[PDB]
Structures are given as C-alpha cells and as structure tokens.
C-alpha cells in the first residue's frame, strides 16, 4: 500500500490525540514514568471514499492490513510502545478514524533543584517520518486529548495534560519529521518528607547543641559525634531516592550545610576543653555562652538565604 | 468479521465472570497485585446457529480467529493481560461460551492510614468499547464469579471476591463504554509487626527512660542518644516497606511522636546536669522524680488519643 | 479437531509424568521456585490407529497441529509455562506418546515455623478441563516420573519427587476438572545460619553479661546498649530473608526472647547503680552475684522450652 | 520431514561447535552466567545431495523450514536459548552446515570453598534426543570450538574453553540421549577483596588489641565493642555477595575465627578490671602483658593452620 | 532470495549509519548502556533497477520480505536488538535505502582508574557475515551518523559520536566478517561526589584529628573509633556503586590510605595515654604537638603523590 495522493502539493495532516487511562511508576533515579493510554489518529484518504446511498452503510470498518496507516512513533520512549488496535472507521468522504490502546515506559528528564518541593513537566513526543510520495505533518485534535479522573501518580499531584498544538517540523536524514509535544504537568507531594526526613534531621541537630550547656568533654564528644553519624545516615538515605545531579538540590544544600554546623560544634567542644585544661574556664565560658545564641541564629539566617536562592 | 446483528434496536449483552486461581505479589510501595484467573464470556451470535441433526455435533468448537469475539479489556492493568484460550463453544441457537485463562499485574490504590491494621478493596475493571454497528454492554453471570479455596495472598487475609452487577455505562471519545467492577476485599495480617517492629521499638524507648533513675550525665547521654539511633533505624525500616503518602499513617504517627519523647528526654538529662553542676541537685531531683511518672503517663495517654483518632 | 470418541461412556485417561531436569531459584519471601522439566502425556486415539504390516512403519510421528492433544495446564504456576514439544509418537493401536520440555515459576506456599531447621513439600499441580464431547481424567505413569541426579536446589537438600496417583476429580464452572499432585520434598541446609547468625548473636549476648562482673555504670550502659543494637541488626537481617508470617518462627522466637534478656540486663545495671549511689553496695552486690547464675540458667531453660514447643 | 535414512544400521552423527562472542553476568548468589555465542551443527543428509555440474552451484542454501534439522537443546539452561540462524549450507554430497547465533542464561554450580581465591569450571551441556527412525549421537568439531579475544567476564579471568569430545550416551524416558560437555575454566580476580574487605577487617582487629596497652576499662569496652560491630558489618557485607553453602568458605572461616578473638579480648578486658578493683593490679598486669604477645601469635598461627587446610 | 550478483569479483559494500535518538541506563556495575537509534543501510542490487520514464515513479518502496536485505548484527549486544523497519526505498539504478529503528542493551567495558573523574569510550560494533555467493564489506556513510540534541545520559556528559570508517575485515569459522566501530565518548559528572562523599569523608577525618588537642583517652578513643566507623560506611557506600576491579581506582586509593591515618591516630592516642600513665606527660606532649603538624602535612603530600600517579 502507498500513502494517499495529494489534490495539489499540500502535505498530509494526521490529527492526533492521547487520552491517559493509567499513569504510574515515576522513577526519580531513572527519570522515567509508565503510561497506559489511548492514541487516536485521523487523516483523509480519498481512495477509501464511498457513496452512503449505494453502499447502504454510513461508515466502513477495516483491519489495519487492509488500508494505509501512518507510521507514528514516540520519540522519548525506552522500548517501542505496546499497542493494540481498538478500532478503524472510514466515513463516506474517506476520513479514517484510527484508535489503539498502548503502554510505554517514557523517558522524560526531571529538575531536582527544588526537591522535594519540585514540580515537573513530563513529555510524550509523537513523531512521523515523511515518505517519498508525500510529506506528513502532525496536528492536535483537542477534543481527543484528555485523561481519566481516576488517573493517579503515587506521591505526585497531576495538574494538567495538554498538547503544544503547533508541531516541530525539521529535517532528519534528508526527510521531513513532524514532532508533537504532549505535556503532563505534575507536582510532588512533599508532606511525607517532613515527619520522615526533615524533622528527624532537625531534632538530631538540636540535640548536638545541648553540648553548649555542658562542661563534660566526654559527654559533648558523644553528643556531637553520635548525632553526626545519624546525619550521615539521613544524607545516605536521601541520596539513594535521587540520581547524581550536576547541580545542587534544595535538600542537598541543607544536608551539606548541616555538616559545617557539626564541624564547628566539634571545634567549639575542643576549644572549651583545651581552655578548661589550660586553666582558662572563664574564656571557655564566654565562647560556650556565645555559641548558644550564634548556632541557632546562623542556622536560621543561612536557611532564610538558602530558601531565598532556591525559591 | 463484524458484530452480531440486532433483532431490534437492543444492545449486545456480553455476560462475564472472573474465577481467581492464583492471587499473589501485593506490592505496597507500587500499589499493584498479580492475579491468575479464568475469564469467561458469553453472548449470542445468530449467524453461528446450526442444526445438530445435519451437523452431527450438540455444540461446535471454534478457534478465536474463526468467529467474532468482543474486544474485552482491563482498565487498571499495567501491561496487556497474558491470556490463553481454554475453550470457545457454540450451542445450536448461536450462544457462544468463551473461556480463557489469564495473568495480569493490576494497579489498584491502597489506604495506608491504619497501617499495619488496614483492610483494602482491590479492583479489577473489565471494559468494552461499542462499535459503530451496535452498542456493547457488560453483565455479571454470578455462577461464573468466584475464587479457588487454595487462593492465598502472602501476609493478607482474603475476605471476599464479588462483582458490582450493574455496569458503569458512559461516553468516551464519542462511543459508549461498559465498565464492570470486580472487588477483592482483603485485610492485613498485622501479627509479624508486633514482635519485629512494635515491641522492639517500645523496649528501646523504655531503656531510654532508665536515665530518670541515673545521675550520671555521661551514662544518660549514651542511653538516650544510642536508643534514639535505634529508633531512627526502625523509622527507616518502616518507611522502606511503604510508599510516600500525602497523609499520616498510624505507625507513622507513633514513630513521629516517639521522636518528641527522645527530644524531651535529652532536655531533662541536660537540665538535671546543668542544675547538679550549678549546685542545685535538690531542684534537679524534683524534675527527675516527676519525669519518672510524667513520661510513661503522657506516652500512654498520647497513644490512647492516637488510637482514638485513627480507629 | 475433536477429542477421541468413546467405545462406551468411559472417560478419556491421559497418563502423565514429570521428569525434573533443572530445579532452581527458591524465593522464601515470594514462596516460589523455578522448574525446568519434561512433561510426558499418553492417551489412546483410535482414529490414529494403523496396521504395521500395511503401513510398513511401527510408529508414526505427527506435528502437534496434525492431531488432537489434550489441553493440560498447571494450576499453581505464576505465568503460563514455556513449553517446546520434543516428540509425538503414535503406535499401531492409536496410543499417542507426547513429550515436551517446559519451564515455569511455580507458586507453592512454605511453612517457616521451624526456620532455618525446616522441611518443605513443594507442589506442582497438573490439571485438565473436560470438553463437552467427553470427560477427561488424569493418571500417573510412575515410570515417566523422576528427576536428574545433577538436580541441585541451592541451600536445600532434595529428598523425593513423587506423585499422588489418585487425581482430584471435581466440578468447576459446570465442567469436570482432573487435578494431579506432584510433590517435591526438600529440607533446608541450616549449616550456614550457625556461623553467620546464631553464634554471632550468642557471642554479643554473652558480651552483655560481662556487665555482671563490672561495677562501672558508664561501662555497663555501653556494654548492654551497644550489644542490643547489634542484636537489632541481626533481627533486621533475619526478617529481610523471610516473609511476614501470621505465626511465630523458631528464629523469630529466639530473637524476640533475647530482647527481654537485654531489657532485664538494663534493669539490673540501673538497680546496681541506684543502690551504689544510695550507699547500699552490699545489696547491689547480692543482685549482681545472683544475675551471674540467673541469666545463663534462665536463658538455657527458656531455650529448652522453645526447642520443645517447636520440635 | 523425517530424519536422514541410514546407509546401514549406523547412528547419525551431528558434529557440534560453540564459539563464545560475549560472556557476562556471573551471579555468585544464583550460580548462573549469561552467554552469547555461535552454535555450529553439521550432519550428512543424502536426500539433499546434488551434482555440481548439472546444478551449476557448488553449495545450496536452505531455509530451516525446507529441510530436516536435529533438535539440539541445552541441558543446564534456565529458559530456552534465544537463537537466530546465521546460515544453512549444503555441499554436493549432502553435508549440511548449520550456523546460528544464540544467547542463554546457563546454570552451572560453583565451589566457594576457597573464596575469593577460587577457580571455577562453568559447563554448557548440549544434548540430542534419538527419534524412533534412528539414534542420534553428538560429536565435537574442534576447529569450530573457540572464543573471541575480547571475551571478558567482569571480576574473572578466562583460562580456557574446551569440549569433552566423547559424548555421554544414556537412556531417558525410553529413548537414547547424547550429551556433550563444554567447559569454561575461569579464576576469580581476588585483588579488590584485599583493600576493601581483608585489610579493613585486619585494621579494626589490631585497633581492638590497643586495649592490651590500656588500664581504662571504659576505653577498652569502647575499643573492643566498637570494633566488634565493624566486624559484624564486614561479616554481613561478605555474606550478601555469596549464597548459603553447606560448607565453610575460606573468608567465612577467617570471619568466624575473628569473633573468638573479640570474645576472648572482652574476657581479658573484664578480668583486668575485676582484678584492678579487687586490688590485684600486679596479676592483671601479668595477664595484660601476656595478651600483647599471645593474641598476635595465636592469630598468626591459626591463620597458617587455616590457609594450610584450605589450600 | 539470493544476494546481488557481482559485476566482477568485487565484494558487496553495505553503507551504514547510526543516529542516536535516546541514550540511557549506563550501569557502572554491569558495564552496560541502553541505546535507541536509527540504523540506516544502503547497497546496490542491479536486479531492482528500473527506468524512471517507463515506470513513472522516481523510487520504489518494498516490504522487507519482497527483496534481499543483508543480515547485519551487533557484536557486543546482550540480547538481539529490537528493531522495526521505518522505510525501504529503491532508486532507478537499484540503490536500496533501508532504515530501521532499534533498541539494544550494549555491553562495552569501562575504565574506573580515575573514578569519579573518569571519561569513557562506549562502543557499538556492527558486523556482517559473508555468504557463499559473495563477500560482504561494511562502510560508513558519515551523513547518516549522528545523535539528537536532546540525547542525555544521566550523570554523564556526551562528548562525541563518531565511527572508525575502516572496517575490521577478518576470518571467522571459514567466512569473512566485516566489523565496524561506532564510538560514543562520554565523561562523568563528578560534581555530586564532592558534597555527598568527598567533603563528608574529609570532615569526619579532620574531626578524628581534634584528638591531638585532647588529653582525655576515653574522649580520644570515642573520637577516632566513631569517625573510623563512618569511614567504613563511606567505603561500603562507594564500593556498592562500582564493580570489583583488578586495579586500584582513584577513590579506592584515597579511601584505603585514609584507613592508615586512622590506624596511626589510634597508635598516637594509645602512646599518649601509656606515657601519661607512666608519668611521662612531657614526652607524650612532644608526640601530640608533632602529630598536629605531621598528620595534615603527610595527608596533603600523600594526596599530591596520588593525584600525580593517577592524572
Ligand atoms: C526494685 C526495682 C525494680 C524495677 C522494675 C522495673 C520494671 C519495669 C517493667 C516495664 C514493662 C513494660 C518504664 C521504664 C522503667 C525503668 C525501670 C528503672 C528501675 C530503677 C530501679 C531503682 C532501684 C530501687
Ligand atoms: C540459641 C541456640 C539455638 C540452637 C538451635 C538448635 C537446633 C534445633 O534444636 O533444631 C532442631 C532440629 C531438628 O531437625 P528435624 O529433622 O526437623 O527434627 C524434627 C523432629 N520431630 C519430627 C520429631 C519433631 O535439629 C537440628 O537441626 C540439630 C542440629 C543443629 C544444632 C545447632 C546448634 C547451634
Ligand atoms: Cl513507539
Ligand atoms: Cl531544519
Ligand atoms: Cl521530505
Ligand atoms: Cl487487558
Ligand atoms: Cl501452565
Ligand atoms: Cl536450549
Ligand atoms: Cl543484534
Ligand atoms: Na497499513
Ligand atoms: Na475474532
Ligand atoms: Na492439536
Ligand atoms: Na561511649
Ligand atoms: Na526442519
Ligand atoms: Na529479505
């Protein structure tokens, strides 16, 4: 079979639409998500036209094999989509209405800069390669673009599913390619991070600061070192749920900065002891008293500065 | 092939039934479960009618390819079900009796609010898209809906497997869709959580309270900090077996609240030491004596309040 | 094709046999094992009968497509078995001898009560659905049931592979079903558990008891708390290699009970210190001296009681 | 199609050869490895013979479907090999030359007794089932057995790839089977184990022995207990990279024995303290002084004995 | 179908080109990467030639089945590539222009010597086996070799994608093979390693050196031992993200060397205490004062030497 012939030198417009049924498995480490949707295609093939009076029927159904169907592919998919044809319906003028149900593992990159308070735009790129007979251009039939109400992405809030109506037409290996951008806008459900990582991490830090109300070096060393190890465990736990980024993430910055607070606490604890031993407990008292205000104030201001830079 | 023709303007009724053989792999993190069942379908196709006298055979067997079979799909499956046709039997009036055995990874959401004392309703949604010739409606043949006695879901108790007999008939992309709801009611086997997480977690908390019967700051710091770290390990262990929820789970709440008890224990331990050093051991004694009653009482009441709010 | 016709109203007997080639991947958490075996089937089809004198040949070979083959399925498999036909041989009387090589992930439940000193009976269930023409019954050809000498299941000892010769004949969805039970009896190789979990766990417990020969509260607190944390690590490591059971496992019981010993050791250590501080070291001495005998004796008796209840 | 007819009563010899292209994924826990190789088969079928003068051609190419091909299977594979036919070439005498490229996950057991200083013999078993017409026997064409120079198995050294030329001819399910043994001899690259596990483990042990130059019980308890926990982490890390064996591995033995050294160090530390408190520091001094020599000497001799027993 | 006939004794040139669409999943442990690309092939088949005047058309399209297509395989792939034909176009002279879109898991080894400051050259090897009719040689059509601008490999920077234009022509199993080398040059994004592993690891080391400004043995033992354990956790974390190499990696060397610094710190701490107890605090003071300069200086020089040897 060959593509439909042009009335003039115009390209063939394949109207598209994606309707999400199930949306799942957003892997932050892999920057992938799995989708299960309907793909609808519509184009005019004058060769398929018929008189409804003479033929009796208003529409004719065909098996994929019988007629010409445009080779539509997804750009950012991992492996080729699993698709099963639901229906192919031809109207008297020759307008074909194709429908298939597919599933694919889509590879769309993520911006972890504001993690876990981040919002993402997932992409689904539809593409078509022009044949030698005629050039093929994609379009968006907005009435056939949507999502089911039940569509839930675990740990995420689905904001919108829209399509950038004007395709990206470009040359590739000396043939026209018409690319379409379907955008799924989502925002992370940060709630869990608060009682599981953020608040536990702040509690262990504040426990390290109880060393500023203690003259016992042995007890201080235990307080600051033990809590530093729990902070290492939280740093490791966090960096496992995330990929290696060439930029600093919000949680990454807080986690990093907190190491400096532990390092300075060890220095203060060491200075206090050295001074007490050197028979200068009055000077050690001044430093310890100052640290009680300095540490919370510098922590609070540094955090205001960070939140400002990141948001 | 085309769908059966109507006697009048009636829709075509496809009678359904699911009989679970094997039920397994309930992933709490993924909110998926795997199923291995029988799918039975039955509809009348007058075109397949035959005389048993002339044909020799009461029933005729056909290969799926030979006749028209309704395109029945599952809504909430991950990938398309793996199915193998067991039998297709046609009676002289044209009544088709389809049987297939399938396996699928079903995606049904879970409510972790009362975890690990939670009960779930897993869903299996059957659907059918109406063709242009005639509208297709699903039905439940209750005699062909059930589960095997051997059906075991590891770490869960299977309560019931029933079907909501009235289908959800709705419009989708300008065609009628007939959806059916099969519900598998299950309840978690919480027993293992008690000797593995709950009791170990309470033992480490009570060990931290032995600091209220000790004047040794160095020993108290070790007691409260060491047990706090074991609590962090239990928090990490628990949050690995669960997905990130936008709500507080029962175990999540207890785990969180216990951090506050560790934080207040560190404050008491610090106050006691400061006072002893400041040569006020009488005042430190009053606080320590009070804490011995306060901590268990406040822990017990807070837990009564939590159990009340959650159950 | 249709099933063989009966001489009288007798059912069709399909003689079966499974011969294990490779047995592997026993997942304790999933309660699954992978198998790679031969499946032999034998039944009489008089339509296939031939005279060896006239035909010249003693046996005739056929492709599966050419003749009727009973639809034999496995009940407790995860997905449908991967099978490849080795041979189909027909004798002059019409006796068909089918052979196929298959692989499947079998889902047979396990009893962890005596873990890691447990023995299991893995099951492979063969089933057949009766057709409308005639009822099909399964049988065991014991000469075609066995296992290869090389068959090794890592971390397990394979005791026997036998079949319960009388099939379970029952009604299902208004048709007769003939189920057969193939039993693979295995017993766990507990040896590794001794130097890796049991002995390390006992050593850390005995180290905690060196606190009964020490008057240093700070040292005792360190001894009992540090070793309690190592016991938590062993509890976590053990519960990862096992699924969540609604019953107590042998190792689970020992692990749980050892927590009580740590809890009572903390109480003794606390009492000794309180008494020493209260200027009653004589009474603290009596308690410490008693604990030296009490702890090992109660540990040894409690273990005799547990081993008795479990074995 | 039927097998080639015999000139006399001789069996049909299928000459074989395996040429490894890619060798990868050696799973120690699973005792599997993945292979990607060429399988070459050669047998004489007189029915395919032709005159090169009359036919013009020197060799004839055939599609697998066109001619009889022996059903060659792998014994110790997990699932059936993925194979794609490269070429089928017939010479004038009827000698068929088959070539296919395959990939399979091979299940060959491993001997961890000398781990990580172990050497293995991986096996690839080729087999063929005799048909009723005539018996089929395998052979090794040594010119068609080899491996690519690039063949690399990560963390292993590939020593040799040879075949045991005489097949194992035996009865199975009342038919003759001809098995062939292809052996891949490999040896572990132990280098990484030295700076990552062995030396770190020895350093922590030697740190525990600094307690023999200290009179501080509180410091000794910390030294011996802390280092014992790091040893537990190394034991856990090691037993994760390995399966549960019914025998003692070399690293397993060293790891186990080191626990005894920690246990005796705790006893010495306890004895020294008891004696110092009992006002017998002279006797405690003798024991501590002796331990300084005893511990390294007994450690060094015990290791000589172990290396001797294992190698 | 047979291969194209030669004009003379020349070999058949198959012009190739790979255009990367999606590049993903670089597994450091497995030394694999997944690719999703276009594979373009071009060769002349005079049998397919036509007159554009007489035929009307300028190019003719064919289904793969209709014409002869060279059997092109990938050498270093894990399993056979998943490919789907985009287009086959024949020009009047008989020049065939094949295009397919494929996906494969490529196995190309990595050099971890400079990790995480390493650069890699990933390889994609195209190969072709000569048939008996005529020898087949590969070529690189540079206009059909490239990569998409969007091509992103998580945690890596893609430098170049080029092809070594001269094929490696060699004999294999008595037939000519033409191999082509496609090279993807990438360099690791080391940024994340600095705040997550390197700086945390240096902070814990510097904390251990605060023991040179402390006379408290109990406190020093805690400081050096606690920080040594955190270093063990970082060593474990690092060796999990990497395979077992028969050489020393850059991070491996630093991590190893840091153990020696901990070991010497324990010796100093032990010597200081022994001397203080032996009533020689003046000599212990000299050693402690020297260590304050020695440790940072030796650490800094040793690191200069390592960076020099590795870069
Ligand atoms: C004579 C002292 C007996 C102590 C018994 C404690 C039993 C606690 C049972 C908990 C069950 C769940 C709640 C934690 C209490 C810690 C006990 C501290 C004991 C101090 C003793 C002082 C010496 C006079
Ligand atoms: C704390 C220390 C815990 C030690 C547990 C001892 C093992 C035990 O008592 O295990 C019990 C098993 C029983 O094996 P069975 O064949 O199933 O006996 C079934 C008997 N009936 C059918 C009569 C009920 O004996 C063994 O394997 C003994 C060897 C293991 C010794 C390990 C010691 C360390
Ligand atoms: Cl696609
Ligand atoms: Cl362009
Ligand atoms: Cl174009
Ligand atoms: Cl489905
Ligand atoms: Cl099956
Ligand atoms: Cl095979
Ligand atoms: Cl390939
Ligand atoms: Na088509
Ligand atoms: Na059909
Ligand atoms: Na059949
Ligand atoms: Na301590
Ligand atoms: Na064949
Ligand atoms: Na072809």
Residue numbers in the entry:
A (entry chain A), B (entry chain B), C (entry chain C), D (entry chain D), E (entry chain E): 5 to 315
List passages from the publication reporting this PDB structure.
At present, the best structurally characterized pLGIC is the G. violaceus ligand-gated ion channel (GLIC), of prokaryotic origin. Each subunit consists of an extracellular domain (ECD), predominantly in a β-sandwich fold, and a transmembrane domain (TMD) composed of four helices, labeled M1–M4. However, the GLIC is a pH-gated channel, activated by lowering the pH, with a maximal activation at pH 4 and a pH50 around 5. We instead found that proton activation is a complex multiple loci mechanism, with the key contribution stemming from the coupling interface between the extracellular and transmembrane domain, with E35 acting as a key proton-sensing residue.
The mutant of the vestibular pair on the β5 strand, D86N-D88N, yields a significant decrease in pH50 greater than 1 pH unit. All residues were also tested individually, with most mutations having no significant effect, although a large majority tend to decrease the pH50 (notably D86N/A, D88N/A, and D91N). Mutation of Asp/Glu residues at the complementary (−) face, in general, decreased the proton sensitivity of the GLIC, with additive effects in many cases, especially for D88 and D86. However, the pattern of phenotypes does not allow discriminating whether those residues are involved in proton sensing or gating, because mutations to Asn/Gln also produced decreased proton sensitivity. A structural analysis was performed on E26Q, E26A, E35Q, E35A, E67A, E75A, E82Q, E82A, D86A, D88N, D88A, H127N, E181A, and H277Q mutants, by solving their structure at pH 4. The key mutants at E26, D86, and D88 were solved at pH 4, each showing a structure similar to that of the Wt. All structures were in the apparently open conformation.
